[model samples]
Target: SQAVMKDMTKNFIKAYEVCAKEYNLPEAAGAEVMNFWKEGYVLTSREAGCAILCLSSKLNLLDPEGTLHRGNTVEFAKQHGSDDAMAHQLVDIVHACEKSVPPNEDNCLMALGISMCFKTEIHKLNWAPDHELLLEEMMAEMKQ
Candidate 1:
């Protein structure tokens, strides 16, 4: 278990480095992103929604009001992935976007945006308990 923790830590730093660069995030923003993930500070639907909006803003990827935003994210995922690759990154994004609050109209809209961006199965979302397929894949990745 220590070894797994070590692996996750090391690999996480490496992943953060890649994300920082790829997303062209600022130094403080990137650091905050890493810490936000490492600390699991986001626990509510509103918090989760805000976290994603924050990161997307920093990355110049925010598009809360436009179809092009979701399209862009999907294209980004498609360009960088197949099954496993897409799954891993999708999980990362989903973890960043998942919420703990009761779903409202706005919440559903935000959730729908995420589901569309990651191309998640609408029929299998499990939004109340958090996104199921995304978490399942993350669990599978961790077990490996």
Candidate 2:
């Protein structure tokens, strides 16, 4: 699982890089993936979702270690939440989940956990056709 965590983070950075370039954001802003994480989902999200995102981020962790992760929900809000519904929603979830303002690393970690679970749930419920494609692609990627 620890290994999974490490790998997911690296993959996340890669995915985020694609997102950043597509949107013209700075390369260091890969943390933006956090925005995909929804607040309503956080409060009522399934535990399975957290696990998926956790694994994904760990897989991609190598790419964004020293970067000031732009997606630390509450921090994003303080800086940009006022201008974005997702950021404000994220802050609400963080405060409710962590029960505090100016969320700490622990809360940030919680946000990531929630995000992980979200991704896992999505994978589990993916359309059969899409899932088949994902399975084939991932298998090929992992093959020697």
Query: Which stretches in model 1 have alpha-carbon errors above 4 Å?
Result: 1-45, 62-71, 83-144
| Cα error of candidate 2 at position 126, Å | 3.2
Best by TM-score: 1
Which pairs clash inside model 1? 44-100, 45-99, 45-100, 45-101
Candidate 2 lDDT by residue in tens digits, 14-124: 454444444455433333444333332223322233333344354442236422233553232333213344333433342244333233255344545544443443333
lDDT of 1 at 8: 32
lDDT of each: 0.41, 0.38
Q: By TM-score, how accurate is candidate 2?
A: 0.24
* Top lDDT hit: 1
Model 2: runs farther than 4 Å from truth?
1-27, 31-105, 128-144
The TM-scores of all predictions, comma-separated, are 0.30, 0.24
Q: Where is model 1 poorest over a 10-residue stretch in terms of lDDT?
A: 1-10
